């Protein structure tokens, strides 16, 4: 299921709905939940699930194709952390 | 913290879109997402990130409060691997 097959499918669902309506909407919440967690806001959807961000400590990094030491600074980075809903019915193992 | 209701608000003054859709799409579009995971598909959204599925097995766990170490049972877990496109506009963020 990629970002076009998740609009395919909504939009065969959804007759009532244009489905040049459901593309644009899709790709309009996407990136609405992409500028919010660059502004440095988390999302928070129950029953699906919620964007934070954790923040990461500058440390001298490698290359791990030559092997030299590149600087790196802070910065942080997206999470995501299931929801209950979300977990119960992936997991097919009880 | 961004909600279902500020999403939908947000199609209703960029699309132009009712509320009643607004709402129903951004509903529509979670539940599309859960449903792929829980058949067991990974959800590759481009310029977002990508929601995998990996099989844990049981490993040695604990009473984080006492210390009784309890077995944590197999499952399977939906992880998220935010793209590059994603981390670059997330790195100079700020907590606000």
Known sequence: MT???LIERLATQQSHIPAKTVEDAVKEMLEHMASTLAQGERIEIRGFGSFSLHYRAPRTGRNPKTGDKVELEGK????????KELRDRANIYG | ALTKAEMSEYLFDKLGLSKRDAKELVEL???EIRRALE???QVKLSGFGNFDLRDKNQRPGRNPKTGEDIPITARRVVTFRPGQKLKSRVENASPK
């Not at chain 1, 942080?76 to 929801?83: C, I, L, S």
Request: hydrophobic share 25%; proline share 12%.
């Open chain 1, 3 to 5: 970002k076009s097959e």
């Open chain 1, 76 to 83: 942080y980075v997206p999470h995501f952390k299931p929801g």
């Open chain 2, 39 to 41: 058949n067991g598909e």
């Open chain 2, 29 to 31: 579009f979670f539940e």
